[PDB]
Symmetry: D2
Subunit: 336 residues, 4 copies
Amino acid sequence: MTIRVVINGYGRIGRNILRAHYENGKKHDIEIVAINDLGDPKTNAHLTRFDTAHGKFPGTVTVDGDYMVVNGDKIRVLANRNPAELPWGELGVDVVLECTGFFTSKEKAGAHLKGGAKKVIISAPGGKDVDATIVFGVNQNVLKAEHTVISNASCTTNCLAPLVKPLHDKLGVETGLMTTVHAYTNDQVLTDVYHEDLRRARSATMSMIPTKTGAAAAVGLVLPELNGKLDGFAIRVPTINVSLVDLSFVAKRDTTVEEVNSILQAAAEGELKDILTYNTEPLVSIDFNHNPASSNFDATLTKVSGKLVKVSSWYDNEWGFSNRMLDTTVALMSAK
Amino acid sequence: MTIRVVINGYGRIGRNILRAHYENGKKHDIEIVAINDLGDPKTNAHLTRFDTAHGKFPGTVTVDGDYMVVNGDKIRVLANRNPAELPWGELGVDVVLECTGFFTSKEKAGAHLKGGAKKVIISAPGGKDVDATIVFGVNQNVLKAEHTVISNASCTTNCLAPLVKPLHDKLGVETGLMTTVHAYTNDQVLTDVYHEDLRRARSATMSMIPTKTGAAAAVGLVLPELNGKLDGFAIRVPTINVSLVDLSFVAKRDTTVEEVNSILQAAAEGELKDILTYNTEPLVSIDFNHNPASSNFDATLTKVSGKLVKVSSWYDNEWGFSNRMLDTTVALMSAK
Amino acid sequence: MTIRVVINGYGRIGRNILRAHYENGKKHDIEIVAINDLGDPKTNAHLTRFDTAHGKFPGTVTVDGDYMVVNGDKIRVLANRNPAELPWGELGVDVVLECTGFFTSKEKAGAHLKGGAKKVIISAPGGKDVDATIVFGVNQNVLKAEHTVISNASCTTNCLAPLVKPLHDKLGVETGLMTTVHAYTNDQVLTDVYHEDLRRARSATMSMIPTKTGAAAAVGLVLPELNGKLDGFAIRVPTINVSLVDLSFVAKRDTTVEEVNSILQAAAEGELKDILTYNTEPLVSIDFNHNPASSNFDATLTKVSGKLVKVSSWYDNEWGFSNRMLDTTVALMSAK
Amino acid sequence: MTIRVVINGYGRIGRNILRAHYENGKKHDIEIVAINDLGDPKTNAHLTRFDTAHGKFPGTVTVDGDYMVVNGDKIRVLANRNPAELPWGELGVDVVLECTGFFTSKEKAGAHLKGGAKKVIISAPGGKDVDATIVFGVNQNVLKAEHTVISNASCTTNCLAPLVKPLHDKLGVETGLMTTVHAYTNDQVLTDVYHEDLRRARSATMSMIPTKTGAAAAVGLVLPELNGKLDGFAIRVPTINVSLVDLSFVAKRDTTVEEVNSILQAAAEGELKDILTYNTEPLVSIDFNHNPASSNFDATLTKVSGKLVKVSSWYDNEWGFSNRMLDTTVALMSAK
Ligand SMILES: [Mg+2]
Ligand SMILES: [Mg+2]
Ligand SMILES: [Mg+2]
Ligand SMILES: [Mg+2]
Ligand SMILES: [Mg+2]
Ligand SMILES: [Mg+2]
């Protein structure tokens, strides 16, 4: 059967989920029947047609009354800050893609359930009470039909976990620390202005700006064997999109650059195909823009010194994650 | 006979006013006795000490109880959204520098007067009910002792008016059109996201972005002879500070590049000294960063074809305006 | 029936000509049989596959011996700084697209003729002795079979001429001055370093940088009725591609914003279709990236104040010009 | 008793050495008596007066005949491609600061000695035949009076060595891998164009760009106990100046964040004072611009998991190195 989906929060994440669905030729048996956003529907349609990072949408978008029509599909448009008031039950909603950032716990995301939706996928790290945290390609097999509110982790965790899973299986990971060299986001600023975080209060276009991230530590939610073994932080730099996971870890046994690369090449050609890619060309970050993979491992950067191993992976922090939201939607509704 | 001033709204404008006052070695007979802002005082002190565009403040800033100490001066720190409740009368406030953007009409800014302040200067274009709109160096002579709420115009108007006045006096301006090539501001965005204006919704770091400007029409408030004679627009480009007025106008008689430049050089050396500067060096925009002048005419860029004249002037859209706020404060208190 | 073309200089202009030829489905009866460049063929093939400004080439590129194979077409790769030594006669070359910038006079470009080529098109303004200067869509009808070395003008002139010709025909242009807000190019620098021009010696990523340009003054070569009537200069700003022509001119009779826009709308739908486009949407510069038109008139920016008229047009300064090089190749070989 | 120095190559490195000498109040007993450069002396003086990254020189620069006058000091200006022909002996030159990049071996740099100079310091990694490689503050004690050609290492090595030496002494470094997040340089490009390295051929303003660095292996030249223990690479990102060393290493034993930070705090307060700094404030990269230290350790970024340690240090990749060139000059002439 066809999964009826709605997108709560038509910001960048929600817009890129919708665009990912149409730009892969709706390969998932999914129908987006509604979007909720406080912005003017004409403005959101315009930002769907044109994007700086991801170019022009290769389709048609029009506004007709209470609907945005995308390639002939009429999508109901809503504007209500309180999700519990949305008519999910009347629309027969199967899955709410919760992309606002304000409803990341199971209790808060349950407002969608109160409105009549069957399930919720949070496009972000969830509270400790969520039923599951999923990196598709790594641990979607843990999903069950009884799960009603899950987290899709973060963009960074979806890049790191496919990288570390095969390495732990074949080599063993004692402990690891990560730096993600990360594009700036809209939580940052153009010129210095008041901000809850004194570093993010500084111009993102002119500086490297450290900031905390739990993505490395969150790999333990997806790979329990690595609980407490990984940590790290991020350095925001002046690029608009595409980021880099830089993981240094102590292997449990002696290895080489070639063996490390061979493990990830086999994973990219096998169990993790189309989720993890294997790259040997001399590419730069923009070459991975609009790439739907979760983790684009760069074998040219691999370094080994003793037991310390350094592996790096490019990821489009918007496009890979938005595509994974669709994969996880299908897996959740297929769970028994 | 020292003017006791307070800053309402310690954003970038309010911070740059305070920094301008202390960096020129408190050259005005002004004492900043209080700041009102809803933000954490420690955060605002940090952003006073460090700025990307304007560098490190060459002084000391500390927070001690209810005061921010700048070079040893205790400045009361307040946080009250209703100006009528502020203790301006108890603090003997002469002038409120209104820098929040929420009290730009005389009706709204009068709340400061109810609180005990004598006068208010709005750091932006004012409503139609303001007693005056002032570009210092051009029309501060219109101020009278009875004026209680005035506008300091905008940064763009403070660059255009000193540029066009001497040319109008000696040549005559029949009509004119201008483009303001302008640095991005915090009203813009890092990557495409909802905005009231569909063009400002687009990444400011990657595109030239057209936007409206009222400077051309607002010059008529400061120079009534030019009412309705000027029009134009602005283009935001990926620079953090410093902007450019590019004015094309039809003169009332034929002229030459040499005469046009000579007129502005005389004004820069005379009546408009320290407000309008005359530049002949091969400079670029960043060379005018942290320049306190309102209008830096670039004689190297002048073009003339018969009556058609093209003149260009660089201006630090933050620092020039901030210094002019201090000049206008003294002029208002000296008005008879 | 097929025009045999070679590209001398496989820098950005030459590469974008080749990419334009293949991305339009090779719609012109043109075969690129050789490219000459001093760079390594593997390097030039890599830069054909991947570009920052224009994305990934939607085709295949490989290196096989002395050939670069593009979508199965074997293209001879040469590396000789002296074009007169190139085997144009042996390869039956009809037209050399001269894109190095070193052979812009008819005498110098004649080196290709000595090598056996029939004709040369310079991808830049030519010396005074070139047989013609062409803005395709405007004056390609002046080409004759006897012309052997021509200029395709510049990207800026190809944007300006389609904009100003309809206006001169219907309104009349007395005189005009223009600014081109222009993306930086590889003649500029990342951080201050020695340069023949002291303004271009300054970081292009941080400043607006004035620079000379002859595009407006040279328009008389393409539209002799406007000889001597136009001039201007450029402001380089921190964008990687796409620029804006900003023309202010005195019309010979009274007009209005609506009449000015109507003139250009008729031209865009008629004589100048697909060369000049007519835009009314609230777009920004990146929206015109990879747009093959010569001149994208922005009707939303038009201003009129008395007899002074301001019209503006976006242009992809690389892609429009590269596509026009192909159009002019066909027109030159079709000339009677 | 005053060391007479000349600068061979007045590019950015030579300019910043001169500016460092004058902007610290000539704190070294050094007089710059000549500079050799093939560029126009007026252009080089202009770029000394104005810089985008480092602002305006706080002094006087004029050109008078064959001399450039800096704060009243007449500096002979020479232009000779053959250093053996330079009048170093006639000028009594003690130390040649070799900053051209063309004389990085002792064999090549000896041409200055043939010209009459006593010693040469290469402002870059040297060939295997150089008498020493110096990171000032770490191993300048290895210098001997008999040394005639030495290397000052690189900016990255001058940041890494002060960071890792105290950690090795007190904690022990078994092995380490580093990433240096590095500002772009003038070896990179604004938009994709030919380069000997296929990654530096890509726009430096739009991408994170991996590149090789010898700093990790070159630390073994200054700290022989660490020979072969460190490896890594660099990521160029879109900032104009200031870079970051991000070192992950396996310690010889389990440790904690507090112990790691304490070791570096003691070093910054002791033997490595003014070379290594200790920072606890929430700063970003631009806050370290124009900072003369070799290594600005950021205690806020430290991470520890068992034996695995991650430490980060900011460094002005231009200004720190330029000041170290002066320190190493004095040490070389004081060596016994
Ligand atoms: Mg079950
Ligand atoms: Mg009261
Ligand atoms: Mg055909
Ligand atoms: Mg031949
Ligand atoms: Mg004929
Ligand atoms: Mg000699």
